[PDB]
């Protein structure tokens, strides 16, 4: 039984675009039906890393449940997670991806964070996250209280360190910012570690899955 994504792109649906809780939560599917021009995807402009690969890996799925990998009310006691954006406006009001959280400063501080997750779900777990690129150093200080920031995601197959590139861009959907999106499959048994002192667009929900 095929999976309709409506007017959404795989990016939007999987990120949790606000115009994307839309839909009939399904547990399994064979192939995926998506418009060539999907209108609601990366509501906040930016590059989705290894997008074509992800669309293949998701093309065929036998089990699929969403679950809250890093719970909003206990994971981030030293960081602000309330921020929302008019770039992700649902029904008129500002909002954000349901599967991510925009961490920003709290009490004038953005403490070094490191939070980890061990896969205990006996299925591959798809983990998504973003990194924010502000267009100037004024924004950078305002959101994260640090001029030089890093994000580091590390598992047994994944190891990358992002530094945000800060400079002028063209406006897409009235935004100068970019968020770059990233994803890794987390094998049952592996542990993924996020470390950052700024710019992390943190995962909130993730997905357990299988492919036949």
């Amino acid at each position: 039984a095929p999976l309709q994504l409506g007017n959404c792109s795989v990016a939007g649906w999987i990120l949790g675009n606000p115009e994307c809780e839309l839909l009939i939560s399904r547990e399994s599917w064979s192939y995926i039906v998506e418009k060539p021009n999907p209108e609601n995807g990366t509501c906040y402009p930016g590059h989705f890393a290894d997008y074509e690969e992800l669309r293949e890996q998701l093309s065929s799925v036998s089990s699929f449940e969403r679950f809250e990998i890093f719970p909003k009310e206990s994971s981030w006691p030293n960081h602000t997670t309330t921020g929302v954006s008019a770039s992700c406006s649902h029904n008129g009001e500002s909002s954000f991806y349901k599967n991510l959280l925009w961490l920003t400063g709290k009490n004038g501080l953005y403490p070094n964070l490191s939070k980890s997750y061990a896969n205990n779900k006996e299925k591959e777990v798809l983990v998504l996250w973003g990194v924010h690129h502000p267009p100037n150093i004024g924004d950078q200080r305002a959101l994260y209280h640090t001029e030089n920031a890093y994000v580091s995601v590390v598992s047994s197959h994944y190891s990358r360190k992002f530094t945000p590139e800060i400079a002028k861009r063209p406006k897409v959907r009235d935004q100068e910012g970019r968020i770059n999106y990233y994803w890794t499959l987390l094998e049952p048994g592996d542990t993924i570690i996020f470390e950052a002192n700024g710019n992390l667009i943190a995962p909130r929900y993730a997905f357990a899955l299988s492919r036949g």
């Epitope: 309330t82 502000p134 924004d139 305002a142």
Partner: single-chain antibody, 234 residues
Framework: VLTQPLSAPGTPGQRVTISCSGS????????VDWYQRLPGTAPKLLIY???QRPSGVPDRFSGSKSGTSASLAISGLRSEDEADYYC???????????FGGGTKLTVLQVQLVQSGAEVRKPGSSVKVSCKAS????????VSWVRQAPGHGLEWLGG????????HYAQKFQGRVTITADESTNTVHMELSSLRSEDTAVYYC?????????????????????WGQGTTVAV
């Protein structure tokens, strides 16, 4: 909400300091602004981003912030300093702009043009407009603020310069509509289902952005330029 001492004495020359105490949802984490309001005139931005003076402000005004409490400091205290001082910031959890109750101090370029100072019966609605010149609402948030006579400042809401999306303070959602016609460089506040509770002077103000690329609330770091006010009576 922000607690201010209700009153503050001062004598010329001497240095006086207003204080503003908040929760962490506000003040604690977000930038704090201070406004001064003399009578008849419009409120004036003294300090934004905790400690920044906008141009045209004497070295006499200084601002600081520590933990959950900010402070406005006047050092050479003229007589023309006698006015109401307000204290402002964003509050997460409320997700709104939020004003101090006010302190009365007692002793011993872009332009916005609001229009339509007018009268109305209860139950009706009003549409105030605000036109820009030698400047724009293109890369700036605009705020609407009212003051009921013998009351403090009160944020009705704002316009974020991304898809022209409105943002309505809790107390007002459902009654307020804010819109823009950018061809005419004007912003419009329409308040409906009026009542005497709403008779006030209404103001339109442009916000200094703390960040243009972040969550909405970083657009509102300080109202530096104000309309003239529009009086509305019910």
């Amino acid at each position: 909400v922000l607690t201010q001492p209700l009153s503050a004495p001062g004598t010329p020359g001497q240095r006086v300091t207003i204080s503003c105490s908040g929760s962490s949802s506000n003040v604690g984490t977000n930038a704090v602004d201070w406004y001064q309001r003399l009578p008849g005139t419009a409120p004036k931005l003294l300090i934004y981003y905790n400690n920044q003076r906008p141009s045209g402000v004497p070295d006499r005004f200084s601002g600081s912030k520590s933990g959950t409490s900010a402070s406005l400091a006047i050092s050479g205290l003229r007589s023309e300093d006698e006015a109401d001082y307000y204290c402002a910031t964003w509050d997460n959890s409320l997700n709104d702009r939020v004003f101090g109750g006010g302190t009365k101090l007692t002793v011993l370029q872009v332009q916005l043009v609001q229009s339509g100072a007018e009268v109305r019966k209860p139950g009706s609605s009003v549409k105030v407009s605000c036109k820009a010149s030698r400047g724009t609402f293109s890369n700036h948030a605009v705020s609407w603020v009212r003051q009921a006579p013998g009351h403090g400042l009160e944020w009705l809401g704002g316009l974020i310069p991304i898809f022209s999306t409105p943002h309505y303070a809790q107390k007002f959602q459902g009654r307020v509509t804010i819109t823009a016609d950018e061809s005419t460089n004007t912003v419009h506040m329409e308040l409906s289902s009026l009542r005497s509770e709403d008779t006030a002077v209404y103001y339109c103000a442009r916000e200094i952005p703390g960040a243009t690329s972040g969550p909405d609330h970083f657009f509102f770091y300080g109202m530096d330029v104000w309309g003239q006010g529009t009086t509305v009576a019910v």
